[PDB]
């Protein structure tokens, strides 16, 4: 079952107003929510109200939904409430800059999918769950955690007073749940490689057509990867601090494996931290740079993400060369 927020929590959120000085900052792709922890639920309400409107959702239901989602993120080093709001902010910046390409249903579904995309993450990878035959891997054979995050999103919507989508027609309700399911499953990095390869081929051959639902689904999937990996698009000190959290979580998985008698892969071994800069250079070359390159080709307003990713790749190269630590 899903944890539920308290009345004090959602009522407090209903009263929040964003300081006007932050309006200019929140619109920027490089915005880092880090320094504003108490404002994170309020920043999410602000982004939903800007993209979709103050009357898109019943305010009481939206505040209960957000505070219950926060309560169902766990105290893990990386896949936590901060990550959820960071990914939702990147989606907000992408949607704001490509507004007319997305329907009202898609913008509301994608912001909610981003806030919920790692719901109830336990700090263990799909690799761990599958290798050790965890019951989640029996229920969900592929994209294990992602299917769980979607099931948890539906469970929160089913809590009394939390169904923010109940006012949609029956056809739009089904459509928004499908947008959310596909977007959350797209955050499984195993699916990204094939998705990006298909999109690059569609773009290069001139067959990419945003009026085609299957092509829209793929573009949305790439947008979800771009948002999920957006710590690589922040200013260097922020990118480096988030990388410490990414590895702290993977090292705890590696420690658990060692206790269970299985040697972890080097990335998850805290005794192999010296290999992190080369691991990051590999991740940027194989995953991040191609992701933002293809995204910028399809959605030119997203170019700042690619520029920042390239800047951070250069910083990791400087670390390898001993110019930075
Ligand atoms: C964003 C992100 C991510 N999801 N996973 C990694 C693995 C340690 C390589 N690095 C980054 Cl930078
Ligand atoms: Mg995830
Ligand atoms: Zn994530």
From Swiss-Prot:
Query: What does the record give as the active site?
Result: 79 (proton donor)
List residues binding a divalent metal cation 2: 118
Gene Ontology annotations for the cellular component aspect, listed alphabetically: cytosol; glutamatergic synapse
The entry marks the following residues as binding a divalent metal cation 1, namely 83, 117-118, 228
Write out the annotated subcellular location.
Cytoplasm, Cytosol
| Tagged with keyword Heme | no
Tissue specificity comment: Abundant in the putamen and caudate nucleus regions of brain and testis, moderately expressed in the thyroid gland, pituitary gland, thalamus and cerebellum.
One GO biological process term: regulation of cAMP/PKA signal transduction
The record's family statement is: Belongs to the cyclic nucleotide phosphodiesterase family.
- UniProt subunit comment: Homodimer.
Its annotated function is as follows: Plays a role in signal transduction by regulating the intracellular concentration of cyclic nucleotides. Can hydrolyze both cAMP and cGMP, but has higher affinity for cAMP and is more efficient with cAMP as substrate. May play a critical role in regulating cAMP and cGMP levels in the striatum, a region of the brain that contributes to the control of movement and cognition.
From the Swiss-Prot or TrEMBL record, give the protein name.
Answer: cAMP and cAMP-inhibited cGMP 3',5'-cyclic phosphodiesterase 10A
Query: Which lineage ranks, top first, belong to the organism behind this chain?
Result: Eukaryota, Metazoa, Chordata, Craniata, Vertebrata
Q: Covered range within the whole protein?
A: 715 to 1037 of 1055
